[PDB]
Design a binder for this molecule. Structure first.
Ligand SMILES: CC(C)(C#Cc1ccc(-c2ccc(Cl)c3c(NS(C)(=O)=O)nn(CC(F)(F)F)c23)c([C@H](Cc2cc(F)cc(F)c2)NC(=O)Cn2nc(C(F)(F)F)c3c2C(F)(F)[C@@H]2C[C@H]32)n1)S(C)(=O)=O
Ligand SMILES: CC(C)(C#Cc1ccc(-c2ccc(Cl)c3c(NS(C)(=O)=O)nn(CC(F)(F)F)c23)c([C@H](Cc2cc(F)cc(F)c2)NC(=O)Cn2nc(C(F)(F)F)c3c2C(F)(F)[C@@H]2C[C@H]32)n1)S(C)(=O)=O
Ligand SMILES: CC(C)(C#Cc1ccc(-c2ccc(Cl)c3c(NS(C)(=O)=O)nn(CC(F)(F)F)c23)c([C@H](Cc2cc(F)cc(F)c2)NC(=O)Cn2nc(C(F)(F)F)c3c2C(F)(F)[C@@H]2C[C@H]32)n1)S(C)(=O)=O
Ligand SMILES: CC(C)(C#Cc1ccc(-c2ccc(Cl)c3c(NS(C)(=O)=O)nn(CC(F)(F)F)c23)c([C@H](Cc2cc(F)cc(F)c2)NC(=O)Cn2nc(C(F)(F)F)c3c2C(F)(F)[C@@H]2C[C@H]32)n1)S(C)(=O)=O
Ligand SMILES: CC(C)(C#Cc1ccc(-c2ccc(Cl)c3c(NS(C)(=O)=O)nn(CC(F)(F)F)c23)c([C@H](Cc2cc(F)cc(F)c2)NC(=O)Cn2nc(C(F)(F)F)c3c2C(F)(F)[C@@H]2C[C@H]32)n1)S(C)(=O)=O
Lengths: 229, 229, 229, 229, 229
């Protein structure tokens, strides 16, 4: 077909999902970056998304449900296929799983043509709509230690989201240098500030190990009552 | 047709038209959800827009104007229509007013195919383009009583806007109780605050109907003169 | 025809109507950019004028009345058309509404030739003459709030003019930051100045909501009599 | 063709470029305005972009590289062309440079059809995408004079940007009145404010011809030391 | 081909480029994910590198020089090609520019086989090796303002690097919030910290417009001498 994706379109789509993540702007750009492409190019563009595993899982669920709807609307004709004709597509074929490049190209160049690529394109674009409406990406700045949460658990969440985040290694080191102490519970923040800027992660952790325990609660209560008295 | 509308796309279009009102980002979504849809499906999508009657009227005017332009571009050809072929569309025929689903299907799957859905799509896209460019939905946040506006007239305008506003009943009552008094000029706001928080609407109107009259002007003039005397 | 508009001429016309607006200097440029062009190209240039809707409505009225005058001068001959010959153009055909590219080209290359493009050019250029003489574009700097006008109405007028005005978005933001406060009458101007430079639009509108009311009039009268006393 | 652009699509596209400049908002609208339009109409739409010549150059570079890719994937046909069929398109033909309207219509209506318009639309979409990512239009608000920039060079840059600006003439004069003195560096701004608002441009340049010379530096240094002593 | 890449390999390679950027870990992964892959699949994997334009340019230069070497060592076949066999590959064909998928499949299935995919993989390996040794990605952490650099140029470079950065929008906003003032030179940093955290970018640029001018140098020199005296 003459409407296959060029290398520039693939790189543009990759950059689009990189900078714009899954903002609404990803919907029109995709809507123009895969017009007339056979479904395998659409699958290639769907595969080029790095990260956002949950979002693409919702996308896959949407595509599967719409393939089921497609199969519901068009019943499968239980009859022998004429040598001149070829089998009608099913929802999986529109998705591209059970259909090869040759079958898709033949479908889009039939008389009358079946616009398999465009149908899969609509399914994908409304899955993208669902992603934009519901999915919210996890950001390191959204990771703040709770009021009664242990510092080990907060550090585990911080590092899990940092690894899941898409960023450079150097900027990730800067993030774990700054936000780890920045977005911390006030009780742990007092200990972290008292430790000093040269304290390592292990030292900070054994310092906040005692927070929330009976000894720390007794100490802070004693400080409060000394301020009162 | 293989690109017929499906419940998921219709629900998604409804959700984007209610959630996003007529923000510019409604142009991509529509342009991605009606791709390949028959004009009947376009009309079905257009009917589900609740509220925004003014914008809907602008959109209908744009459709009619573009259909007139289409009819002027494509002149009517006389003579008997060939039985193998079928009669050519007009502007209203594209619009679906005088064309049934069978006629639209025949147009979209003929040789050569007349893409009635795509021309419809362009006309509708122009309609929403004008809607977003010019039309601004009336919001209860903007209903504020003018300096000389009677309190009764302001209450009537506020209630009309509330009736036209799309929102749940509970949040509508909350918006009433929190914005009818707040969004008033100081001349009425002072009286309303002096009235007390536990004031019914009838008491509100009765107390504030005296503003702007000779008595209220004389009282406020005397109060102002008290400071200078 | 050899005298169709090149892309550079179209861009030059767009720039002319952009920077020069509808100043008289637009008349000579249109007098030269479109010379010998068939009416289709003339309409194409007449379509790239963003904004100035009222001006082009006057221009359309001029063209329609000149088509009527042209029909008045040359009566329509009620007779069969010779197969070698072709129908003479009516008033609308010179404007290109009832005539396509082929008929316009044939008219412009007849024996004797009918200079349809030049006749339409004369009609259009007199339309621009009327636009230059009478039409005055709405400018933001012409938006000044009246002595006894509510601030909400002034804001509505200011923002309507801002939306209708052509400019960059950053320029529009700077203009609504400066001129909105700058172009208010003494009462609203002193209220805005007392509010402060960081006050939001809602705060300014709330403060000016009371201007012109009985309370504000009593307060300013009290201030004046205190200055007297 | 059935999907030829009507006047209102062209005018709406012109307005889109005028107001939205090259924000991402231009990508969907364009893709929704040229749906099914022949690449001749695509060139017609692209020509009406007033200003932003750098962005148009980037777009033309995109179209050239996409045409190169199209010629790369599609090999040049060899041997005599079948009289029933006609010559295969090339990248320049998709871009509309070499192909005429008749050839493009023949491609669109061929069996099987070659979607020249959609391919060219995707190429222009890629160009617009890189424009919105990278290209940043020059704005008068961003013209600020460097600490060591001579006032003459600052004025030259300011006026060049103002001439390149899309805004109207009267608002351009207003911009000259306010921003030119507002955006000067403190050394020039002190002199300009000492001159008074009545000073003309020539007087202002005369008074800021000396900022950076031995006399001015000596004078400011002496003033600072005298304030110290 | 049997060893055609699967969606998981493409996604894994994309993620490898996203996280590891261009580190020594890229060479092993690329050497194992694209094992036995058709050079068309190699090109698909190469197109997915979002950003790193300079590195990709270096890689393509390496591929071009390797193709030149391949054409140098392998002479061009002369005379007619045997119908049973097929034409020999060239350097561009190994690079995948001129070869089609069918040609590469025939090369790999030929007896004896021509391992086009492995040769292309080695060429890309050389390119990646040069990238990891020499190319260094631009990071906002490494953007700092020179001692004599005006704040406007620093801000422009900072924002250009930020736009080129691979990160999410909220993280980029956080970078703008902190690193823009953190990495300024002390002369600008003193003014920026005296401004306060509430200062906007425009206010910061206005305050720092004067550093390096005669007034600012005189003021700092006077302050230093007064501290001496
Ligand atoms: C060879 C080639 C031409 C191809 C192809 C190719 C072929 C088919 C499919 C596929 C398409 C549609 C359905 Cl409906 C199913 C299905 N239906 S089902 C009953 O649920 O199993 N299964 N498949 C797997 C099948 F068919 F192979 F079995 C599919 C894919 C999808 C494209 C896709 C990616 C995506 F992200 C979200 C989607 F909605 C669709 N990519 C995958 O599936 C692999 N994937 N999945 C997920 C997840 F689940 F998290 F969303 C993730 C990936 C990931 F990319 F790694 C990325 C991290 C995320 N690509 S090429 C050059 O591009 O590599
Ligand atoms: C069978 C079926 C599939 C169908 C169909 C169907 C068929 C035709 C039309 C129609 C279309 C185009 C023209 Cl050009 C005319 C016309 N030309 S004219 C000279 O102006 O009168 N007349 N019609 C009436 C006709 F049909 F009699 F011809 C039309 C509609 C429109 C679709 C539409 C809705 C819309 F909002 C805005 C539009 F631009 C277009 N919807 C209506 O018309 C009813 N409507 N109108 C308006 C208003 F005016 F306020 F915008 C409103 C409605 C509303 F939906 F109630 C909603 C509150 C708003 N739908 S279904 C869904 O029923 O199952
Ligand atoms: C397809 C193509 C070849 C063509 C054509 C084409 C064909 C005809 C016409 C037209 C010409 C003459 C008459 Cl006498 C009438 C008519 N007489 S009547 C009894 O009153 O209805 N009707 N028409 C509509 C018709 F013919 F379609 F029916 C016309 C136009 C005009 C050209 C024009 C533009 C203009 F600004 C002012 C004019 F005086 C004339 N443009 C429009 O009409 C659309 N327009 N109108 C107005 C308004 F009214 F506000 F001024 C506005 C537009 C706008 F551009 F959007 C812009 C905002 C302003 N273009 S192409 C490649 O160029 O796109
Ligand atoms: C007659 C008609 C049917 C037609 C046509 C017509 C035909 C072809 C082309 C064209 C198309 C594709 C390529 Cl790939 C090249 C090419 N490739 S190349 C190797 O560089 O020479 N050259 N062309 C010139 C060609 F064909 F004449 F040779 C083209 C244009 C473009 C449309 C276009 C405009 C644009 F802005 C950006 C684009 F990407 C494409 N318009 C121009 O290019 C003229 N232009 N250029 C530039 C600049 F350089 F700044 F970007 C500028 C203009 C401008 F519009 F003035 C504006 C200020 C900016 N229109 S009609 C009724 O519509 O007028
Ligand atoms: C159809 C398909 C199967 C295919 C294919 C396909 C075919 C060929 C090529 C190609 C291969 C080898 C050479 Cl030696 C040249 C050449 N030699 S030359 C004398 O320099 O012109 N030219 N080409 C362009 C050609 F072939 F079109 F002519 C090539 C590519 C490359 C793959 C590649 C990308 C890359 F980044 C670095 C590489 F080393 C190789 N992709 C491009 O080159 C496009 N690109 N370029 C650059 C730049 F240069 F800026 F770094 C950039 C891109 C980008 F990806 F956008 C990304 C931002 C960076 N892909 S599919 C489904 O995958 O799309």
């Amino acid at each position: 077909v003459h409407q296959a994706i060029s290398p520039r379109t693939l790189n543009a789509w990759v950059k689009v999902v990189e900078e714009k993540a899954f903002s609404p702007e990803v919907i029109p750009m995709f809507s123009a970056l895969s017009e007339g492409a056979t479904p395998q190019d659409l699958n290639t563009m769907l595969n080029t998304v790095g990260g956002h595993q949950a979002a693409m899982q919702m996308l896959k669920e949407t595509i599967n449900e719409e393939a089921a709807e497609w199969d519901r609307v068009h019943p499968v004709h239980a009859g022998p296929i004429a040598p001149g004709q070829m089998r009608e597509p099913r929802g999986s074929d529109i998705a591209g799983t059970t259909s090869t490049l040759q079958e898709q190209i033949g479908w889009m160049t039939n008389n009358p043509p079946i616009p398999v690529g465009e149908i899969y394109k609509r399914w994908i674009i409304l899955g993208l709509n669902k992603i934009v409406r519901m999915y919210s990406p996890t950001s390191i700045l959204d990771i703040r230690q709770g009021p009664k949460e242990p510092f080990r658990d907060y550090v585990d969440r911080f590092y899990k989201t940092l690894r899941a985040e898409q960023a450079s290694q150097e900027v990730k080191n800067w993030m774990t240098e700054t936000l780890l102490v920045q977005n911390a519970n006030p009780d742990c923040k007092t200990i972290l500030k008292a430790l000093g800027p040269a304290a390592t992660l292990e030292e900070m952790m054994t310092a906040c190990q005692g927070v929330g325990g009976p000894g720390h609660k007794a100490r802070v209560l004693a400080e409060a009552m000394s301020q009162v008295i």
